């Protein structure tokens, strides 16, 4: 049965609630982004209206075969009316097509659902600036002070410099990047760009990336692995056995692999700067774990909430244990007391 934190009070709406069957008294189903924990349960047999971004709608049509008559894409940053309620979709700075949802209830309550997000000060100048928010449904994935990570920009700098150096030293090295869902495309695209290569991948993954509008994508990606020196593989194959096997498959075109595994967080961040990251090496295979996050760090989240000053916070992540929930509620109290709301 659908949890309370996926239900929007005073509406017939749910958010990211497709794995519960027919939710009682739900007239419109919103989807914040195309990740499996959120879309779990959509298919060609779905016949309720689905409201989402254009990119997320492209993916529903093409990857899940949801019928076009049930897909209701909305433009971003635009006041729209759904079943008589004013709504706005805002950029969530997560994966391609990911949104936050602003709801303007008939009685005057204003509700922000972040979906999955990485808070950024640029959000302090969207349609959020213009009015008060009574309730915030907050992505609390990394809601603890140990979660510190660098900007995406520093992480990409590190990756580009590392790959450029390795291939300059050895023109027969192959670079591999791991993936398991849309998101984090900049990692592999920035590397390919500095090396003067396209990124090679499976037909299925290429199809997925074509659904995303990215400009100049016919330009950066390909299914011809032979002509590419940046290959994309499933995250599961990013280990020494998987990569030795892949290397065998390339037919003596390459003699070394440098592989990247973009991860959310790893406790090396407690003791180490990005500059100081080193790989795991075995034979002619090196694996770098890099902290490329598409969720807010603790401090980024804190800042966003102390700016917004919501009257009530409802966590959507880490809600399954009493110790987690209690920990989060203690932080929310601190933030409020420090900011004076
Ligand atoms: Ni997500």
Swiss-Prot record:
First-to-last residue of the parent protein present: 700 to 1040 of 1040
Role summary: May be required for DNA interstrand cross-link repair. Also required for checkpoint mediated cell cycle arrest in early prophase in response to mitotic spindle poisons. Possesses beta-lactamase activity, catalyzing the hydrolysis of penicillin G and nitrocefin. Exhibits no activity towards other beta-lactam antibiotic classes including cephalosporins (cefotaxime) and carbapenems (imipenem).
Location in the cell: Nucleus
Tissue: Expressed in brain, heart, kidney, liver, pancreas, placenta and skeletal muscle.
Protein's recorded name: DNA cross-link repair 1A protein
Organism annotation: Homo sapiens
Family to which this protein belongs: Belongs to the DNA repair metallo-beta-lactamase (DRMBL) family.
Mutagenesis or variant effect for residue 295 to A: Impaired nuclear focus formation, reduced interaction with PIAS and increased sensitivity to cisplatin
Gene that encodes it: DCLRE1A
Assembly and oligomerization: Binds constitutively to TP53BP1. Binds CDC27, which is itself a component of the anaphase promoting complex (APC). Binds PIAS1.
UniProt induction comment: During mitosis. The mRNA encoding this protein contains an internal ribosome entry site (IRES) in its 5'-UTR. This 5'-UTR generally suppresses translation while specifically promoting expression during mitosis, when cap-dependent translation may be impaired.
């Amino acid at each position: 049965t659908c949890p309370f934190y996926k239900k929007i009070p005073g509406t017939g709406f749910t958010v990211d609630a497709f794995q519960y069957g027919v939710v009682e008294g739900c007239t419109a189903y919103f989807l914040t982004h195309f990740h499996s924990d959120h879309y779990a349960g959509l298919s060609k047999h779905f016949t309720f209206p689905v409201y989402c971004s254009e990119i997320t709608g492209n993916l529903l049509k093409n990857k899940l075969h949801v019928q076009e008559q049930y897909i209701h894409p909305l433009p971003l940053d635009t006041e729209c009316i759904v079943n008589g309620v004013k709504v706005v979709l805002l950029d969530a700075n997560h994966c391609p097509g990911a949104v936050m949802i602003l709801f303007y209830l008939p009685n005057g309550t204003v509700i922000l659902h972040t979906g999955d997000f990485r808070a950024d000060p640029s959000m302090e100048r969207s349609l959020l600036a213009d009015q008060k928010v009574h309730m915030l449904y907050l992505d609390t994935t990394y809601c603890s002070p140990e979660y510190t990570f660098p900007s995406q920009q520093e992480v990409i700098r590190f990756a580009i410099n590392t790959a450029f150096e390795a291939v300059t030293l050895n023109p027969h090295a192959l670079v591999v990047c791991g993936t398991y869902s849309i998101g984090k495309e900049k990692v592999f695209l920035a590397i390919a760009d500095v090396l003067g290569s396209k990124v090679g991948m499976s037909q299925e993954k290429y199809k997925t990336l074509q659904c995303l509008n990215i400009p100049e994508i016919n330009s950066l990606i390909t299914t011809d692995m032979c002509s590419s020196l940046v290959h994309l593989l499933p995250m599961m194959q990013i280990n020494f056995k998987g990569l030795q096997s892949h290397l065998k498959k390339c037919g003596g075109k390459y003699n070394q692999i440098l592989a990247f595994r973009p991860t959310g967080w790893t406790h090396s961040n407690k003791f180490t700067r990005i500059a100081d990251v080193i790989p795991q090496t075995k034979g002619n295979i090196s694996i770098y774990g890099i902290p490329y996050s598409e969720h807010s760090s603790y401090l980024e989240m804190k800042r966003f909430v102390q700016w917004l000053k919501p009257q009530k916070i409802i966590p959507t992540v880490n809600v399954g244990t009493w110790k987690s929930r209690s920990t989060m509620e203690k932080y929310f109290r601190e933030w409020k007391l420090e900011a004076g709301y």
